[PDB]
């Protein structure tokens, strides 16, 4: 909610308390999942044409006791924007792939999980330099695109090191470039997006599966957003990029998400989503196994734009087996019951 | 301080910097205790009758250096409220027992410590579902009550596990129900409150004292709040619920706190409190020993509703002995010097 | 940006997103250095004369992934202020030495690093009680001064312990007193400042170099601030107070910083700084070596008071040798590219 607007700078301070509770046969995915977010979108007029902006967002768990209380920055970036030319923003942001793949990330809790956080240029991530251009230089009303770069983010110990290095390997990444082209018109929306990132010495030489020189992503996506209806699906194919449990990555992964939502006038918005992450010849005695697969059906009710509540039912179609145990991939169902104030 | 109020949504963003310093013979309870809090109470009108709300509050220590900086969520919950029916809010909140026992938690720093944080349904805690009803459905102007449930909050390792599980044992809890009934009229206030919680496998089978199937609490409380005067005391009896050092819990504990405060017009508010936590036949070669006992006298001065400063003198009546050493219970005095801005 | 001003209390909620990236031959000092700050300055009128205030400031790194996210309180203090008498504020604040030495801390990223954080009374630090007096009781328009005390801040383990104790040794400190006297007139500014702190048992008896009973600081400083020009330099001599790598402290250190900045009307503000930290007979087979030495030249461009961007070039004049390796002192160059929104 915009709490400052004066002399051309304006500041919107925003957040939510999500009273969330998971139900499951799985004890590790069962209990209070209450959390809270807090951020600000900032903005300043420099000229007619040029406008500068900042943006921050933190997440703080509220399911944890007075000792440990895990919490983290989600996005943090600053940048400029010139009329009919483009915009450029450096910091922790969304990777360019998300531009397309996010169109299926519309469920209230689950969904949009064929990618992880800090998973190369696939979703959230540190040190994205991002050019974007809306309406193609003000000529084609609808055609937006982006050209993104991500600096190497290696380890803390000597070999393959950066100042911000992380000792976790899945969070690591190398130098990558990615692109996106989206077009919207009368609700309908085509979307292509291609990334390609270098990999760290640690990533290949921890002895994990699905190793190579480069992690690469291809992404097609279609959506329809009109007349109370949101239909959208997407194809994302990856080489050595999709995470596979703790075992490593998938040499090749064929990922597909599809969602159908209708908004009733009184407040209810039921959904019926479906996900899939088929991992092709992974090697090391597994071969063509499914990394993820579930149907997801529930409904959000909207009291208004400040209060909401929802049920979300993950129907996990994965069978229990060695691949789904060695990797440690939850094969059980989960049901989330959310009740959320925001501002 | 309410920084947003518009079209029925309103947001109050609040906090304080407490410049605090402990003096003591105990080196562990001596030094800078400076800390800071920040939260928001949120609120939105949905209808004439229905109003929805959120609330958050963090605490961040300011006595610590640039490396470690410990800090945590205190309360984080969302919920609805319907006129003359009640209110329901899920998240980290106060346990229902606090409804009564908080009437003695009126001292500036010490006091209100016959309960801990995440100590079952006794004070702060994760995953409270809480029904409340003010003025008994708008019929009896004075009679308020509550019906509270708390989900199991076990460990992180396999046996007795939840998604939010903590490896600390005192912070753990099981499924519990609790109630409260308070009545106020012309200042005077009766208050009863009863909780009863299941216990974790770890809690019984870490070999600590005062173990059982259930932790249970009984609480009576009386207060008088008028004519510059605040008199209030309370009785809280517990089975296997009160913490006793690091040794475990007290099979039975008889807890009593009493406070007397007077507010002078210029700003000074002296107090004279007294606490007691008599632990009855605890077992394991201790028997009837005192878990806590101190007289507490100081005074808060109020410059105004934004600035305040105070002295707080803990006169610890506990003697030094095996029970008060094995358990590791501070037998020494403490004096706090607070100087506090807030907003 | 002041988001609350009402009935004499006013609250300014402020922060920035600094899109920062280090370039260097050093891998440890190379990568995304994106971070964010958030604080509030608070203030309340009590009387004509008396005014009470609070202040907080947190820093949260945005170069790190969803698991670890390091962040800390920078300053947190409350205090009162009476017209023509003085002001007194207890909490994590700046040490009194900074009063003078901060006049060289005017560069956009580097500079002001002959002192560390929690480095006795030299810069940031916990538990400063600070008296200050502006314009010498309203008599001499220009002469400001301060009298500061810092409580012992030892370790967490038994010997030399405080409630806030830190297991790091360089962050530790003992009881210290410090002073400052500054005088400004027509831009020109003389400044003297002297501190003297007790040391912890751990500090001497971890076997590190430059050990003694007391860490002491002497500080002279001169500045000129007018006609788009900022010229300022400073001398800081220390006994057993300046940190020297991981090896310990410098028995004696002769520190000097000098800066020259010009503000062009359109927005550019180039600078040309120079630093030096000559460590005299340190002992343990090193003798007179340089602890730090670099020339620093770049330029900040100011779009306006909300957006800015800059380049900052550390030209490290230190040679690579045993002292600069055993201590582990970066001998390499660094170049910072900042782009910063704030509010």
From TrEMBL, chains A, B, C:
It holds the Pfam family Porin_1. CDD domains: gram_neg_porins. The keyword RNA-binding does not apply. GO terms for molecular function: porin activity. It is found in: Cell outer membrane. InterPro entries: Gram-neg_bact_OMP, Gram_neg_porin_domain, Porin_dom_sf, Porin_gammaproteobac, Porin_Gram-ve, Porin_Gram-ve_CS. It is a multi-pass membrane protein. Keywords: Cell outer membrane, Ion transport, Membrane, Porin, Signal, Transmembrane, Transmembrane beta strand, Transport. One of its GO terms (biological process) is monoatomic ion transmembrane transport. GO terms for cellular component: cell outer membrane; pore complex. Homotrimer. Belongs to the Gram-negative porin family. NCBIfam families: PRK10554.1 (NF007841). This is Porin. It comes from Escherichia coli.
